[PDB]
Write a protein that holds these residues in place. Structure first.
Motif, short mmCIF file in Angstrom:
data_model
loop_
_atom_site.label_atom_id
_atom_site.label_comp_id
_atom_site.label_asym_id
_atom_site.label_seq_id
_atom_site.Cartn_x
_atom_site.Cartn_y
_atom_site.Cartn_z
N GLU A 96 0.82 -1.21 0.00
CA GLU A 96 0.00 0.00 0.00
C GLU A 96 0.86 1.26 0.00
OE1 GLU A 96 -3.24 0.83 2.39
OE2 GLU A 96 -4.45 -0.90 1.80
N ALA A 97 1.92 1.28 0.81
CA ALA A 97 2.80 2.44 0.86
C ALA A 97 3.57 2.61 -0.44
CB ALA A 97 3.75 2.33 2.05
N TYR A 98 4.01 1.50 -1.04
CA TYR A 98 4.70 1.58 -2.33
C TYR A 98 3.78 2.09 -3.42
CZ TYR A 98 6.59 -0.10 -6.77
OH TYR A 98 7.02 -0.20 -8.07
N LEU A 99 2.52 1.64 -3.43
CA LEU A 99 1.57 2.12 -4.43
C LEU A 99 1.20 3.58 -4.19
CD1 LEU A 99 -0.84 -0.91 -5.00
CD2 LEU A 99 0.82 0.08 -6.59
N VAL A 100 1.09 3.99 -2.93
CA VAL A 100 0.82 5.39 -2.61
C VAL A 100 2.00 6.26 -3.04
CG1 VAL A 100 0.75 6.97 -0.63
CG2 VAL A 100 -0.94 5.13 -0.84
N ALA A 101 3.23 5.81 -2.76
CA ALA A 101 4.41 6.55 -3.20
C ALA A 101 4.51 6.57 -4.72
CB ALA A 101 5.67 5.94 -2.59
N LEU A 102 4.16 5.45 -5.37
CA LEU A 102 4.13 5.43 -6.83
C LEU A 102 3.06 6.36 -7.38
CD1 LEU A 102 5.31 3.67 -9.37
CD2 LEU A 102 3.05 2.61 -9.24
N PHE A 103 1.89 6.40 -6.73
CA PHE A 103 0.83 7.31 -7.17
C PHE A 103 1.21 8.77 -6.95
CE2 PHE A 103 -2.66 3.96 -7.02
CZ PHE A 103 -2.89 4.04 -8.38
N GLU A 104 2.00 9.05 -5.91
CA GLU A 104 2.48 10.42 -5.69
C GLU A 104 3.41 10.86 -6.82
OE1 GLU A 104 3.94 9.96 -1.77
OE2 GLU A 104 1.95 10.30 -0.91
N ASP A 105 4.30 9.97 -7.25
CA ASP A 105 5.17 10.28 -8.38
C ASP A 105 4.39 10.30 -9.69
OD1 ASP A 105 7.73 8.08 -6.95
OD2 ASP A 105 6.86 9.96 -6.24
N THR A 106 3.39 9.42 -9.81
CA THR A 106 2.55 9.41 -11.00
C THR A 106 1.73 10.68 -11.11
OG1 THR A 106 2.43 6.99 -10.87
CG2 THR A 106 0.82 8.10 -12.26
N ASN A 107 1.18 11.15 -9.98
CA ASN A 107 0.40 12.39 -9.99
C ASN A 107 1.28 13.59 -10.32
OD1 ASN A 107 -2.12 13.62 -9.79
ND2 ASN A 107 -1.80 14.19 -7.64
N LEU A 108 2.49 13.63 -9.77
CA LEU A 108 3.37 14.78 -9.99
C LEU A 108 3.81 14.87 -11.44
CD1 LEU A 108 3.33 15.72 -7.14
CD2 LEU A 108 5.82 15.60 -7.07
N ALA A 109 3.89 13.73 -12.13
CA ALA A 109 4.21 13.75 -13.55
C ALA A 109 3.05 14.28 -14.38
CB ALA A 109 4.59 12.34 -14.02
N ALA A 110 1.82 14.19 -13.86
CA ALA A 110 0.66 14.68 -14.61
C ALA A 110 0.67 16.21 -14.69
CB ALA A 110 -0.63 14.18 -13.96
N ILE A 111 0.87 16.88 -13.55
CA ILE A 111 0.99 18.34 -13.57
C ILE A 111 2.23 18.76 -14.34
CG2 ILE A 111 0.93 20.43 -12.14
CD1 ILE A 111 0.26 17.48 -10.15
N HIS A 112 3.30 17.96 -14.26
CA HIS A 112 4.47 18.18 -15.09
C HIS A 112 4.14 18.09 -16.57
CE1 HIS A 112 7.80 16.35 -17.45
NE2 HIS A 112 8.51 17.31 -16.88
N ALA A 113 3.17 17.26 -16.95
CA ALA A 113 2.77 17.09 -18.34
C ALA A 113 1.48 17.84 -18.65
CB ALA A 113 2.61 15.60 -18.67
N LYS A 114 1.19 18.90 -17.89
CA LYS A 114 0.01 19.76 -18.08
C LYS A 114 -1.29 18.96 -18.02
CE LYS A 114 2.32 23.43 -18.52
NZ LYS A 114 1.15 24.33 -18.38
N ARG A 115 -1.38 18.05 -17.05
CA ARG A 115 -2.55 17.19 -16.90
C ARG A 115 -2.92 17.10 -15.43
NH1 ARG A 115 -0.63 12.82 -17.53
NH2 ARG A 115 1.06 12.59 -19.06
N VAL A 116 -4.16 16.69 -15.18
CA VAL A 116 -4.61 16.34 -13.83
C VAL A 116 -5.02 14.89 -13.71
CG1 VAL A 116 -5.45 18.72 -13.64
CG2 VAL A 116 -7.07 16.85 -14.03
N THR A 117 -5.05 14.15 -14.82
CA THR A 117 -5.44 12.74 -14.83
C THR A 117 -4.18 11.89 -14.97
OG1 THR A 117 -7.57 13.29 -15.84
CG2 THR A 117 -6.86 10.99 -15.93
N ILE A 118 -4.03 10.90 -14.09
CA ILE A 118 -2.88 10.01 -14.16
C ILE A 118 -3.03 9.08 -15.35
CG2 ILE A 118 -2.23 10.13 -11.74
CD1 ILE A 118 -3.96 7.54 -11.37
N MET A 119 -1.91 8.74 -15.98
CA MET A 119 -1.90 7.93 -17.19
C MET A 119 -0.98 6.73 -17.01
SD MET A 119 -3.54 9.75 -19.90
CE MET A 119 -4.88 10.72 -19.22
#
Lengths: 93, 98, 79, 107, 91, 99, 79
Positions: free
Chosen positions: F62-85
């Motif tokens: 759960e913590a690894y997936l949450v940490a992965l989702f945190e990096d996944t979310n931060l890449a979305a704003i980095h890519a001018k998005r709000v939806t994770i891909m």
DNA sequence: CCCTGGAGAATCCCGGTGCCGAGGCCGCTCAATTGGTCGTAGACAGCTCTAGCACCGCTTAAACGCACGTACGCGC
DNA sequence: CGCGTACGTGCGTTTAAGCGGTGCTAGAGCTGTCTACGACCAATTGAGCGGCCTCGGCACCGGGATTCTCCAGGG
């Protein structure tokens, strides 16, 4: 002068046993010596780490066998296990 | 009489190919040597570094920055871009945990 | 020794990105890359300083740099 | 005594069993070191050494070189998937990186 | 059998700095794992440090070097000063 | 008459605030537990797992997936998005070195 | 035991994203998250299997999983 | 506006030099090798008993699915 | 800036997660037991490495060239 332990010649015979027509530079030799020492420290560290958890004072062949399964992944692991198992059976016989 | 006038990008890709198959050190020796001494003098004065000691520092720093640039470049295409940004590096360090 | 952070020149940072397969490099990348390299150097050299201080030595050796890089998961071969 | 036959030849190996056993004892790992542990360590190290050198020799023939130089060792490690994951956190000096280009990067 | 634990010593530390709050066993296991994990890291670094200079002993300088290697920034100089104060009080 | 009809993202923020301050496990115990058994069946047929053994695997995942989702979310704003891909996760593992 | 990868349900993956601060969750992220979770589990559990096999035990303990996560730099507190 | 022929320049294949690092040889010496000898960790055998595995009620919050539209990924 | 779709929101309905219960045995500690095994001690000895001799593979220097790439002309 002072004798420094190294795997300079030991890698060389390994290279000739599988490729008897190519050579190796000293910079590549030092990389191989560092590669051997780092893997040696990782497995022996893991084998010592395994024995402490089982409250065991000695490091056996099973200590190394579990250590190389934990570090080396997949197909690289089982050939090392098969090579390791063959060496112990040849040594005992 | 017309100059050749290479468009941007082609020579950059040519520099990519000529520098990926080569193994020479891109950063010069003394500029990296002087940077190490200035940084080390803040921690301890009258400190010396061996020639091979800086050699270990120079190759490790280049490979870390090249690997960082690889993640920085990978972020650009992921963000539908070909030009790297300072915010691309900040994302790369944050994901790596640095 | 002052203003030695500019020793990593802009074409040198350009050449480093070319090895990484970077198509285009912004003008603000060089200032950021210098800061990242300065932070990375400030950790490895400081760790090597403690390694050199522990050995009662005044010159930092290549072996201490290897141990400084090895403890952070960035082990280096060839030295 | 009898003839001083090396343990490497007894186990059919080239890496030194005695040096591994000596380094295991002085490396501050365990109170005792078993008999087969250096033999197992020598076989694993030799197989890892032989696998990379064969791949380095294969990489050396790709660029038509008869001497193994550090670019060949770096190319051998990164090309192999298992060697890539085993040495993911490993920096190789004078080796560079793989010469790969992004698909959208080409004109 | 008897199982080694760091539970009671942390409790005296907890009452020393904050006597108005307690601790749960679930948080106690986290702190017990925290102290143990740091223990192997410092001892492992100190054992590695002794092996580098062919040293057969681990002294207070071995622990001090491992602290500055592991603990980053201003946290390390507190533990160095705290260790130095305890060493001087020991003698 | 009409319901409240919260705008897309409003309830998402409420779920963000709720799960970032509560330590209850999001993944159910039994469906995760059976996933451990079928994965471990490929390595050992006669294997058992303790209740605390499955417990330790769940929190780390759960913590690894949450940490992965945190990096996944931060890449979305980095890519001018709000939806994770899915490409954002593939970027996240590769930058972290986990392929 | 088959089709147990679907035990990680869609709201369960959505809850994991909400804990990570994700605002919008794509419909194709659930298969990717399950694949990432399967790969991560196939490494830690297999590592714990070798830990359990070496310990002369046929039941996996949480203590063995602790070292399985620790050896990959993912040490867990609280067991 | 797109397809195709010719030529400028960085790159690739090739002949000659050689030189300096790599390959081979001589001691020989210090670490690898041989034999014996015990304290002792470890494999083996029996007991057990505490926790995991399998199935059962149930009920209820968790989860699949369908209808709708507006923030947003994506094309230009 | 424009399109649209596909994912946010909301409940109907279903379906299994979890709490509590019961029974069994899979097997991990636990205790003896007895047994080979490795650190340590004499005794020794043979190729690893520092160093020296030799030598040849590719760096260097050009020479030449296919050969891939851009600019200009035509439909």
């Amino acid at each position: 002068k002072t004798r420094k332990e190294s795997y300079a010649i030991y890698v060389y015979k390994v290279l000739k046993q599988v490729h008897p027509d190519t050579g190796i530079s000293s910079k590549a030799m030092s990389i191989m010596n560092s590669f051997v020492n780092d893997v040696f420290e990782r497995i022996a560290g893991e084998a010592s780490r395994l024995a402490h958890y089982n409250k065991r004072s000695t490091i056996t062949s099973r200590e190394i066998q579990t250590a190389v399964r934990l570090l080396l992944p997949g197909e690289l692991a089982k050939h090392a296990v098969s090579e390791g198992t063959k060496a112990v059976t040849k040594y005992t016989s | 009489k017309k100059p050749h006038r290479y468009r941007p990008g082609t020579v950059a890709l040519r520099e990519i190919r000529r520098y990926q198959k080569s193994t020479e050190l891109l950063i010069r020796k003394l500029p990296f040597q002087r940077l190490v001494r200035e940084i080390a003098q803040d921690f301890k004065t009258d400190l010396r570094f061996q020639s091979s000691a800086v050699m270990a520092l120079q190759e490790a720093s280049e490979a870390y920055l090249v690997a960082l640039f690889e993640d920085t470049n990978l972020a650009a295409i992921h963000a539908k871009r070909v030009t790297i940004m300072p915010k691309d590096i900040q994302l790369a360090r944050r994901i790596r945990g640095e | 020794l002052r203003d030695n952070i500019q020793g990593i020149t802009k074409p040198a940072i350009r050449r480093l990105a070319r090895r990484g397969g970077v198509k285009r490099i912004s003008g603000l990348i060089y200032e950021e890359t210098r800061g990242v390299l300065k932070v990375f150097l400030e950790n490895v050299i400081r760790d090597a300083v403690t390694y050199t201080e522990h050995a009662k030595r005044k010159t930092v050796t290549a072996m201490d740099v290897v141990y400084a890089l090895k403890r952070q998961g960035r082990t280096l071969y060839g030295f | 005594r009898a003839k001083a036959k090396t343990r490497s030849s007894r186990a059919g190996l080239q890496f030194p069993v005695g040096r591994v056993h000596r380094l295991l004892r002085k490396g501050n790992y365990a109170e005792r070191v078993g008999a087969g542990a250096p033999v197992y360590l020598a076989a694993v190290l030799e197989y890892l050494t032989a696998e990379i050198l064969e791949l380095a020799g294969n990489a050396a023939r790709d660029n038509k070189k008869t001497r193994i130089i550090p670019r060949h060792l770096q190319l051998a490690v990164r090309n192999d998937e298992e060697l890539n994951k085993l040495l993911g956190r490993v920096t190789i000096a004078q080796g560079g990186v793989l010469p790969n280009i992004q698909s959208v990067l080409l004109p």
